Structure formats: C-alpha cells, structure tokens
C-alpha cells in the first residue's frame, strides 16, 4: 500500500543516512587543530547610510563592489553609494511591502521582492533618466523571499509556496519550477559558477539545485528549526546556512553532509543573514539579538562582535573584492563595517 | 570644498533625493495603516464593501479609502496561503488590526473536519494574533458581522453546541454579549492594548464611523506615549 512504498523510501533514507557516516572519518575540528587562530577581528563603522524611514529588509552589493541597493518597507528602494554617501536613485515601489532586493552582475537591473509575490524588475542605465519597471514577473502564489540574478536575463525567485522558480526577463514566463520542498523557501544563493544554487526552506532542509536541468541534486537536513539564511563558500564546494536554532551550519557539496556547527551557548536568538567573507575565513552572521557576529569558518570559535544596531540585523553582504560588510538593520540605518 | 565639479553636483542630487524621502515620510506617517485579518469566508469581503475609494497582486490587496481627511489603508491579507510566522513582522507598526469574525459561526462546523467549530477555530486564530510578540502596543478593532443572520439562528438552534458551559438565556441581547466577552478575555496583555468590539450589521453604514472612532483613540494613545503623558 502507501506505507509499503514509503518503507522503501525510509530504507533508502536509511541508505543515504548510512553513506554519509561511511565517509566522515574525521570532522572539521579534528583536522584543523594544527592551524593558527585568526585572532581578534575588530571592525569600525566606516560609513553609515541613513536615508529610509522604515525597516531595511535586504541589501545587495553591486558587482563593481561600490554601489549598493537596499530596500525598505516604506516603499522606497534606494541605491546607495558606499564610498561617499550619496543616494544615486530612490526608486518608489508600487507595493510598499518588500522582502528582498538584488543587484545585477552587470549592474543594469535591480529587482525588488515583495509580500505581494510579484518580483518587479527595474532598469537603471536607461534613456530618459527615469527608473522604470522593465517587467513584473507574476506567477508565484506565495510571497517572495530572495531573488538573486543569474545574469541580465535569468533571475531565480524563491517564493513562499515552496517554489524556487527561474524566470526569463525578455519573455515574462518561467523556464523551470524547482519543486520538492515542503516548507516555504526562505533564502537562496547562487554558486560562483552560477550552475548550481542552494535554497533554504522552512523545514530545516537545504537543497542544492542546478540551473540547467531543474532537479534537486542533494538534500541536506541537519538543522532543527527553519533555515532562515544561506550563502556559499567562495569556490562552490560548501555553503553555510543560518537557522532560527541560533546555529550556523557549514555543509559541503561533495561529501554530502554537515562539516561544522557554529554555536555558542550565550546566544539564543535567531539568524537572519549569513555571508562568507572573501577567502572563506570569516563567516559573518547577523543575529537578531541586535549583534553581528564574526565566526571563524575553519575553527568554531568567535571573533569580534560588530554590535552597534538598535534593532534587528536583517541582511548582510560582503563586497566581491572582500573589502566591506554592509549590514542592514531594522532601525533605518545601514552601517558599512570594514 | 575638496570635491570636483561633478561630485559637487552629485551631492546636490543626493540631497534633492533626500528631500523627496523626508517630504514623503511626512505623508505616509500621517495616514493610518490597518491590518485586516480574519477568515476568508468570515464576511471579510463585506466590510471592504462599505466604503471603497482607491488581478496580478494575488497576495495582498490594499484599499486606500478615506474618511474625514484621514487616508486609511486596509491590507487584506487573504491571499497568503503561507506561514504566518515569517511575514507577520512586516505588519508591526500598523495602527490597528481590524479583525473580523462571522458571528453565525457558532454552529457551523469547519469544512475539512466535522469538529473544531469555526468559533473555536477563530478564537485560536485571534489568540495567536492578539498575543503575538510583534503586536503588543497595537490595539485590535474587532468586528462581529452577520448579526442580521445570527439572531434568527439562535431562537431555532441552541448556542451551547459551541460553548460547553454557558448557562444563560437565548436572546440576542444576552447571548452575543457573552461571545463578545469571550473574546476579550483571550489577551494575556490587558492594558497595553484595548479591544474595540462592535456588532456591525451587513447593511448599515455606521461601522466606518466606528473604525474612525477607534483609530482616533489609538492615534491619541500613540501620541500620549510620544508627548510624555503616558
């Protein structure tokens, strides 16, 4: 019957849960004890960007590592400029509710998120000086969670009806619809070769997809509560997630399991954004106990807490040259640590 | 001032842009935002049909109606067939929560299971909202509609199918004031918010005056905390 098929699945679940133990001869803290500690990493608030009047929900650095979009729920999507604090564009949103944003790798488009599950794509480097809506990618039924760009023609919207999509922008349609999640997906991030991308759902599961075919390659279930944030190691062989179980867990992609947990017994509050620094040594994380921790990524210890916000810390991002780490809080200030 | 001739015009733009935010935050903080909860069949689409001034937006439809120089904004959260725990913190800082409960739901059962009556279901939905951690200082308007449908159902069908220990009469005057007092005992927080109930009909027009009478209370109570009195 139904269970007689499901008994094959659980026994096959008992196979892949066995095969990971067949390979974990020694874990990450057993192999990297003969290394130096990175020591204390204190960072100073080099700029601060004070333009909105609401809660900052997401940011995304441009790939020239200077410009910076940040989207707040008073219906404004300001493109900052991190060197000298100048608002390049203030883009008035159609819907006031915005749950993410993303900047293009070319630097031409920004894409607001939404609680009304319409990923609207804006166009900056245009004739006639405006910032106007290029296309609105209706087609989800949930809400929208995190929508990074592959290039100027392919955007991967996560959603709130457990469907990470893959749109085209010239035509308005989807191309694939990566289904297979149970809880709604909460954050995704692309690999540095943009051929795979992870997605962290709301059932303690992180699935590694692929952009071409459209099927899940691996499913990592190590967490306890919902995975709230996700980000890649800078070579596409690992990714570290963030949960509401206050643990950042660093998985990998070729040994299929969890390499390390990053937990301290004084923190209880959730995680909202994880982003590896360049070279993958400083795993940053923004908790919602108002802090912004800086973990070592090869030993489990901490480093300098980048406290300084008067509310939650709701998005991070390291620049693509690894210079600065902008955090976007729930008071209206961004703070570009360095 | 150690800036080039183009960079000096860059921070003229970044202050002209900064003007058109700060002269817009004093246009969105003046107006009143109203979350509109409640079940999708519970007469939620009737209260929006009282006054309306304003297909792809399947998730949230706003309603920008106005009354006596006060732009209101009802956010009908009905299209979200997702988890409330993730997106409800977008709606903190709302001015009031226009809840809604169909009053005829005392004997009508839930559709998926022939148990957990919709009154006991909406009570568990109300309690999770009214005791949420993002909603403490935000008062709850509470509409009870279908009281044109309710009062003829009680004289021909008893109330105590829903409530196990009532021990009362069966008039619309007595019995509905028990449901109204059944709800307002669900908040663990009692003086940090105040439930402004109302027995609205489906055919009158005083309810939009009532929702004006209830946000003029919470704007005052948002100002007493700001002026320093409270």
């Amino acid at each position, epitope marked *: 019957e139904l269970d007689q098929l499901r008994q094959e699945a659980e026994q096959l679940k008992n196979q892949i849960r066995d095969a990971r133990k067949a390979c974990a001869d020694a874990t990450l803290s057993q192999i990297t004890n003969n290394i130096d500690p990175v020591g204390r990493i204190q960072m100073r608030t080099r700029r601060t960007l004070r333009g909105h009047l609401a809660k900052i929900y997401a940011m995304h650095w441009g790939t020239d590592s*200077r*410009l910076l979009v940040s989207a707040s729920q008073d219906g404004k999507l300001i493109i900052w*400029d991190s060197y000298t604090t*100048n608002k*390049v*564009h203030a883009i008035p949103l159609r819907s006031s509710w915005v749950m993410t944003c993303a900047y293009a790798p070319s630097g031409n488009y920004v894409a607001c998120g939404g609680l009304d599950n319409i990923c609207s794509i804006y166009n900056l*480097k245009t*004739r*006639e*000086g*405006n910032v106007r809506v290029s296309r609105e990618l209706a087609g989800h039924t949930g809400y929208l969670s995190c929508c990074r760009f592959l290039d100027d023609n392919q955007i991967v919207t996560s959603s709130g009806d457990t469907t990470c999509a893959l749109w085209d922008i010239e035509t308005g349609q989807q191309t694939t619809t990566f289904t297979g999640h149970t809880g709604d997906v909460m954050s995704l991030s692309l690999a540095p070769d943009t051929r795979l991308f992870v997605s962290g759902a709301c059932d303690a599961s992180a699935k590694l997809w692929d952009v071409r075919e459209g099927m899940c390659r691996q499913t990592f279930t190590g967490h306890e509560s919902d995975i709230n944030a996700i980000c890649f190691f800078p070579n596409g062989n690992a990714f570290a997630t963030g949960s509401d179980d206050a643990t950042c867990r660093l998985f990998d992609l070729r040994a299929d399991q969890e390499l390390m947990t990053y937990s301290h017994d004084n923190i209880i509050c959730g995680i909202t954004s994880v982003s590896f620094s360049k070279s993958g040594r400083l795993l940053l994380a923004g908790y919602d106990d108002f802090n912004c921790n800086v973990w070592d990524a090869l030993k489990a210890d901490r480093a300098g807490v980048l406290a300084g916000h008067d509310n939650r810390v709701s998005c991070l991002g390291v620049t693509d040259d690894g210079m600065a780490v902008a955090t976007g809080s729930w008071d209206s200030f961004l703070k570009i640590w360095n | 001032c*150690t800036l*080039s*001739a*183009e*960079d*000096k*015009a*860059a921070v*003229e*733009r*970044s202050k*002209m842009i900064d003007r058109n935010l700060r002269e817009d935050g004093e246009k969105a903080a003046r107006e009143v935002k109203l979350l509109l909860l409640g079940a999708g069949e519970s007469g939620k689409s009737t209260i929006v049909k009282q006054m309306k001034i304003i297909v792809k937006t399947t998730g949230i439809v706003e309603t920008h109606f106005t009354f006596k120089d006060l732009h209101f904004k009802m956010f009908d959260v009905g299209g979200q067939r997702s988890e409330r725990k993730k997106w409800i913190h977008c709606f903190e800082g709302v001015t009031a929560i226009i809840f809604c409960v169909a009053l005829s739901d005392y004997d009508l059962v839930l559709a998926e299971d022939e148990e957990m009556n919709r009154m006991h279901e909406s009570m568990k939905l109300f309690d999770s909202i009214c005791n949420n951690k993002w909603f403490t200082d935000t008062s709850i308007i509470l509409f009870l509609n279908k009281k044109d449908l309710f009062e003829e159902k009680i004289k021909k069908s008893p109330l105590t199918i829903c409530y196990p220990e009532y021990a009362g009469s069966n008039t619309y005057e007595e019995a509905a004031a028990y449901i109204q007092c059944q709800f307002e005992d669900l908040n663990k927080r009692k003086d940090t918010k105040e439930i402004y109930t109302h027995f609205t009909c489906a055919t009158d027009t005083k309810n939009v005056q009532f929702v004006f009478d209830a946000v003029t209370d919470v704007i005052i109570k948002n100002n007493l905390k700001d002026c320093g009195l409270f």
Partner: single-chain antibody, 232 residues
Framework: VQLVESGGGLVQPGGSRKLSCSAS????????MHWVRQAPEKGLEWVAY????????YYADTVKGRFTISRDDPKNTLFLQMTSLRSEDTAMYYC??????????????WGQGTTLTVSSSDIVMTQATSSVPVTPGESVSISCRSS???????????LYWFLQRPGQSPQLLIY???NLASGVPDRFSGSGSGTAFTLTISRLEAEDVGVYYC?????????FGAGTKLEL
C-alpha cells in the same frame, strides 16, 4: 527623446531675447541642463548651467550677470534670457542636458540648436592637431593636451570627448575617460595620462567625419578645445 528649442531671429545690440528650450521626451526635473554656444567660425564655449531643481547656477565669464537662466519644471521648458547682448554673442545656441551621479553620462543628448545674430584662472584645453585628412581604414589617434592635471583625487579624469557631424547637432563619444556613451560603436576608445590625452579610433567609417571636441569638466567654467576637423 528630443530637446527642440526656439528663439533668436535677429536682435539689435544692447537689446534682449528670450531663448526657449522645450525639452520633450523624458523626466525633466532630474536633469541639470546646460547651454553651450558655437560661434559660426569658432568652436564651442560654455555659456550657462542650471542644476537639478534650480538649486545651483553657475555662469561663464563672458556672459556673467547679463544672461539670466531659469527652469520651468511643470511646463517642461528651459529659459535663457540675455540682457544687453553684444556683437560677440552671435552664435548657434545648444540646449544640452546632463545628469550627475556615479557612473552617469553627462552631456549626453544635445538639442537641435537655434541661431541668434546681431547687427553692427580658467582651464584651457589645447588641441595641437587641426584638419587631418583621413581615409577609412586607418587607425587615427586624436590628441588633446590639457593645462591643469585633470585627474582628481578620486580616480576620475574629467575629460568628455565629443563629436559633431557637419550641419547636425553634436553628440557624446567618450565620457570621463575611456568609457563609451550609450549607442556609440566600439571603434572610439580613449586613453588618458592626466595632462595629455588621446582619442583613438580603431577603424573608421564615413560617418565619423566632423570635428572632435575635447571638453574638460574639472571646474566651472568648463572650457572646450578648438576641435580638430576630420576630412577626406
């Protein structure tokens, strides 16, 4: 997008004339407009400017005070009113636009241009080339040396190259340095050195005939150079 404009005719000296630039096609109020003239034998000289929202207005030396400029954001026009003009003010008058942020393209679109005729500290840009007759195919390089060190303390060298095909209105080629404008082919590529510059054309077709103005942008008054004619 267009900036058509009107005015001029033929004014007696010491008089006045309103110059109207009705800029139709874009969102006006984010474009700090300028005004650049071309005397019928000479090159370009900067004349006026007005910033976004009429906040900042600079002026040249030779029309300082006696030329007034104004913007009309709702009616979407642009006004230059000249008071007591001389005989040294007969020129074609261009109505150009420019938007100034990080990575913008200032001086991008140039208006049609109206005549105006009469009746009887600054940086200087030299262009040692003049009237180089060319053939299509040869990689030709156009020099423009400057006087100040145009490289600022933030990486930019504010040198906007240009082009004017004969008869028609001019257009941008190369903004700040070795960047290309929206819609020029990949043949124009520049290279700077701070005080001495070079605009290089890899291959050139017949449509790249005309003059090539180098224009600095380091501080107002922003002075054009006497451009070099290209011919056959």
């Amino acid at each position: 997008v267009q900036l058509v404009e009107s005015g001029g005719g033929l004014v007696q000296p010491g008089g006045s004339r309103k110059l109207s630039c009705s800029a139709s096609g874009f969102a006006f109020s984010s474009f700090g407009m300028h005004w650049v003239r071309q005397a019928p034998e000479k090159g370009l000289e900067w004349v006026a400017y007005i910033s976004s929202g009429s906040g900042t207005i600079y002026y040249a030396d030779t029309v300082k005070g006696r030329f007034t400029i104004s913007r009309d954001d709702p009616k979407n026009t642009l006004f230059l009113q000249m008071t007591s003009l001389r005989s040294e003010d007969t020129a074609m008058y261009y109505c150009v636009r420019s938007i100034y942020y990080y990575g913008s393209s200032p001086f991008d679109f140039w208006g049609q241009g109206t005549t105006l005729t009469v009746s009887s500290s600054d940086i200087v840009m030299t262009q040692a080339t003049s009237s180089v007759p060319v053939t299509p195919g040869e990689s030709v390089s156009i020099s423009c040396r400057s006087s100040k060190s145009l490289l600022h303390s933030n990486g930019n060298t504010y040198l906007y190259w240009f082009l004017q095909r004969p008869g028609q209105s001019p257009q941008l080629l190369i903004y700040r340095m070795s960047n290309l404008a929206s819609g020029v082919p990949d043949r124009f590529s520049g290279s700077g050195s701070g005080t001495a510059f070079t605009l290089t054309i890899s291959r050139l077709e017949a449509e790249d005939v005309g003059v090539y103005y180098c224009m600095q942008h380091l501080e107002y008054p922003l002075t054009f150079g006497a451009g070099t004619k290209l011919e056959l």
